[PDB]
């Protein structure tokens, strides 16, 4: 997604951006 949940949780969580490896990805593994 281009998001980073290093300090705070993803904002586009609504879309599907899940916090993974401190990096936010959507659809499982889409940055």
Swiss-Prot record:
Give the originating organism. Answer: Chassalia parviflora
What functional role does this protein have? Probably participates in a plant defense mechanism. Has antibiotic activity. Inhibits the cytopathic effects and replication of the human immunodeficiency virus. Active against both Gram-positive and Gram-negative bacteria.
Q: Which family does it belong to?
A: Belongs to the cyclotide family. Bracelet subfamily.
Ordered alphabetically, the record's keywords are: Antibiotic, Antimicrobial, Disulfide bond, Knottin, Plant defense
What is recorded about the protein's domains?
A: The presence of a 'disulfide through disulfide knot' structurally defines this protein as a knottin.
Which cysteines pair up through disulfides? They are 1-17, 5-19, 10-24
Question: Which Pfam families does the record associate with it?
Answer: Cyclotide (PF03784)
Q: Report whether Membrane shows up as a keyword of the record.
A: no
Q: Where is this cross-link: Cyclopeptide (Gly-Asn)?
A: 28-27
InterPro entries recorded: Cyclotide (IPR005535), Cyclotide_bracelet_CS (IPR012323), Cyclotide_sf (IPR036146)
Annotated GO biological processes are: defense response to bacterium
Where exactly are the transmembrane stretches of this chain?
Answer: none
Q: Say which domain of life the source belongs to.
A: Eukaryota
Q: How is it modified after translation?
A: This is a cyclic peptide.
The protein in question is named: Circulin-B
Classification from the root reads: Eukaryota, Viridiplantae, Streptophyta, Embryophyta, Tracheophyta
């Amino acid at each position: 997604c281009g998001e980073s949940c290093v300090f705070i949780p993803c904002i586009s969580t609504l879309l599907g951006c899940s916090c993974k490896n401190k990096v936010c990805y959507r659809n499982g593994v889409i940055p």
